[PDB]
């Protein structure tokens, strides 16, 4: 049997809103460690890797390693019926074809019980080796989301170029070009809303902005986002899930 | 333009 | 002649949004007691009954029972053309084909005068006062939330009431849902309790489209009273602030 | 070369939101005096005239007269990318095919630089200063309100100015509306209510679609000036109080 | 569905 008690329900809500619009069908991996999800988009151009550790739940119990084939759209529907302060409880049986979601209001005398049908999945499991990247930019979530949205009005692709002074995002379309420049902020007092760069050698890669804007839906999860870049290797956009796991987006470059 | 996430992982 | 002066104009505005999207034309019956509206939707599956008492207006004058047929969408437009602080005045003639709405601003810098065309429409069913099996008085907002949510699952809702509490159930092509509201004890404000009055347990099936049509009157009251008995339609009642009552009637499924 | 530094960035944004929905392509004439735009709408029924004075900018430098054919939608997009406190800088070369917009952050930690492609487009006939029958200076918000409201009744508005006040009238299948704005009452501590300068009573008919197109410039000024005379076009004037003016011209009588 | 009439009268 699998039964997990998460009290910060908003988290899961947010998480699913970060996935429904990017990946349709998904394989949730439940194991003694926690939940791990890893899937590609329909075109095999990006990759989402979610990790939620059992150390983040109020009560986590796993018996057999379970592999749930879930439709993220249906799950997003079912989770929109949950409150941001609702305590969520997920459960499933070893030989089950359904996941049960129990939303408990803060002992409000209200209790929602949904039963989501599961499915059989013949997935493709990719191997992402741990790397050291040339450029690593830790910036505010809001500024990165801004830049992506903004440069989306100009063209569809963005040229991210990282160097020691700051990072610069460039776009070009039938109506012109855009160049946003973020400098390495030295906020002695404030930690968030800072742009810290860790460079090994300048990098300049071209990425699609549609998938970056898909990635930016996870902004409510973290106040900071970490971009990781190295020549000829995919881009890693990393959001931290409040000290219990991480959501990692990997995006293939252009040419 | 535009590489699949393949080419790098297997 | 009919002439009413309303100071709380927003109120009437709200009412129209509770009616505009459900019923198109309606027959207002104005009498010395007040305004009464009673009409069904185009599918004859629900029924709206509005009662506004003469004692709720700033000024009320009615002589003979007047039956004015008005399109609620046009009235909602013309009333949205009113200011939040404007004093509203409705007027009509005995043998008239137009109702006059006069929005009067304080100090009298601006004064709007709209003349809405009337028409002939009208069918009015007879609801005898009944005793209902289950009567649940709960917050309006929670009911509207539940209705929309369970509308995301399926279109029909199984409401099951018993002495401890009520349970709303839906089933669709993506699963099943069961929300359960328990009778609250030690609730401080009586606007945010779930009170049940049971005579015999009830389990009825209702369409969710019309429930979400009904939930548009939520801004009117912070509480809603559901009244249900087996084989008899559901009564969703919103109380208008010390001025009247809005009654939605919904036929069950099968 | 042309290069202007504006500190009040909001102005330009507002202007673009006031023009994009009325005119598609536009010819900006930049000279040592300032910016001048004069164009008709997609239906060639009204006329927009924007004037921004070089003395209203924080820094203005122009060498050769530039005639930039720009898409107002793209410019509005690029301007929505600006910060409320960001310093805006426009730039162009004498023989250039691109307009540069540079948004500078307050403490020099973010810097956006967009390059908008220009285009060639034909055309600006001359509206000489005229004497108008009626000239009404009223609040911007109230006029935009009235136009919006009366748009729900009919498509055309009959503005009638006289010594008592100005009156806006509409009529459609659902009735008729008549808003009446009267001169200032209370005390003479209200110079700025509805001030009228009349020469001869006026009663003109104007299209409401284009009036609502014009009313998008309401954020630019707290007052709007209507200028009207029979058989001659109406002048809706918004003053950019510290920079110049935006003027919409609309012909009456169907 | 039942139509409110059926009742109600």
Swiss-Prot record, chain D:
GO cellular component: centrosome; chromatin; chromosome, telomeric region; cyclin-dependent protein kinase holoenzyme complex; extracellular exosome; male germ cell nucleus; nuclear body; nuclear lamina
Stored PANTHER family: PROLIFERATING CELL NUCLEAR ANTIGEN (PTHR11352:SF0)
Subcellular location: Nucleus
Assigned protein family: Belongs to the PCNA family.
Signal peptide: none
GO molecular function: chromatin binding; damaged DNA binding; dinucleotide insertion or deletion binding; DNA polymerase binding; DNA polymerase processivity factor activity; enzyme binding; histone acetyltransferase binding; identical protein binding
CDD domains registered for this protein in UniProt: PCNA
Function: Auxiliary protein of DNA polymerase delta and epsilon, is involved in the control of eukaryotic DNA replication by increasing the polymerase's processibility during elongation of the leading strand. Induces a robust stimulatory effect on the 3'-5' exonuclease and 3'-phosphodiesterase, but not apurinic-apyrimidinic (AP) endonuclease, APEX2 activities. Has to be loaded onto DNA in order to be able to stimulate APEX2.
Disulfide bonding pattern of the chain: 134-161
Encoding gene per record: PCNA
Name of the protein this chain belongs to: Proliferating cell nuclear antigen
Assembly and oligomerization: Homotrimer. Interacts with p300/EP300; the interaction occurs on chromatin in UV-irradiated damaged cells. Interacts with CREBBP (via transactivation domain and C-terminus); the interaction occurs on chromatin in UV-irradiated damaged cells. Directly interacts with POLD1, POLD3 and POLD4 subunits of the DNA polymerase delta complex, POLD3 being the major interacting partner; the interaction with POLD3 is inhibited by CDKN1A/p21(CIP1). Forms a complex with activator 1 heteropentamer in the presence of ATP. Interacts with EXO1, POLH, POLK, DNMT1, ERCC5, FEN1, CDC6 and POLDIP2.
Location in chain, cross-link Glycyl lysine isopeptide (Lys-Gly) (interchain with G-Cter in ubiquitin): 163
Post-translation changes: Phosphorylated. Phosphorylation at Tyr-210 by EGFR stabilizes chromatin-associated PCNA.
N6-acetyllysine modifications at: 14, 77, 80, 247
HAMAP family: DNApol_clamp_arch
Source taxonomy: Eukaryota, Metazoa, Chordata, Craniata, Vertebrata
Residues annotated to bind DNA: 61-80
Further comment found in the protein's record: Antibodies against PCNA are present in sera from patients with systemic lupus erythematosus.
Chain spans, region Interaction with NUDT15: 7-100
Positions of post-translational Phosphotyrosine modification: 210
Disease tied to this entry: Ataxia-telangiectasia-like disorder 2: A neurodegenerative disorder due to defects in DNA excision repair. ATLD2 is characterized by developmental delay, ataxia, sensorineural hearing loss, short stature, cutaneous and ocular telangiectasia, and photosensitivity.
Major localization class: nucleus
Top-level lineage group: Eukaryota
Gene Ontology biological process: base-excision repair, gap-filling; cellular response to hydrogen peroxide; cellular response to UV; cellular response to xenobiotic stimulus; chromatin organization; epithelial cell differentiation; estrous cycle; heart development
Glycyl lysine isopeptide (Lys-Gly) (interchain with G-Cter in SUMO2), cross-linked positions: 163, 253
Effect upon mutating residue 251 to G: Complete loss of interaction with UHRF2
């Amino acid at each position: 049997m699998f039964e997990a008690r998460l009290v910060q329900g908003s988290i899961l809500k947010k998480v699913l809103e970060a996935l429904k619009d990017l990946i349709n069908e998904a394989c949730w991996d439940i194991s003694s460690s926690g939940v791990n999800l890893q899937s590609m988009d329909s075109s095999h151009v990006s990759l989402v890797q979610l990790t939620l550790r059992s150390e983040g739940f109020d009560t986590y119990r796993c018996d057999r390693n379970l592999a749930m084939g879930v439709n993220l759209t249906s799950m997003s529907k079912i989770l929109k019926c949950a409150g941001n302060e609702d305590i969520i409880t997920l459960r499933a049986e070893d030989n089950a074809d359904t996941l049960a979601l129990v939303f408990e209001a803060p002992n409000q005398e209200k209790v929602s019980d949904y039963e989501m049908k599961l499915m059989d999945l013949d997935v493709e499991q990719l191997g992402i080796p741990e790397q050291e990247y040339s450029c690593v930019v830790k910036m505010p979530s809001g500024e990165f989301a801004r830049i992506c949205r903004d440069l989306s009005h100009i063209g569809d692709a963005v040229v991210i170029s990282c160097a020691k002074d700051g990072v610069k995002f460039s776009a070009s379309g039938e109506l012109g070009n855009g160049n946003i420049k973020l400098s390495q902020t030295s906020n002695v007092d404030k930690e968030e809303e800072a742009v810290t760069i860790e460079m090994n050698e300048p990098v300049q890669l071209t990425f699609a902005l549609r998938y970056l804007n898909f990635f930016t839906k996870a902004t409510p999860l973290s106040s900071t986002v970490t971009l990781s870049m190295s020549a000829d290797v995919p881009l890693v956009v990393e959001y931290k899930i409040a000290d219990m796991g991480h959501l990692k987006y990997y995006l293939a470059p252009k040419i | 333009r535009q590489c699949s996430m393949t080419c790098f992982y297997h």
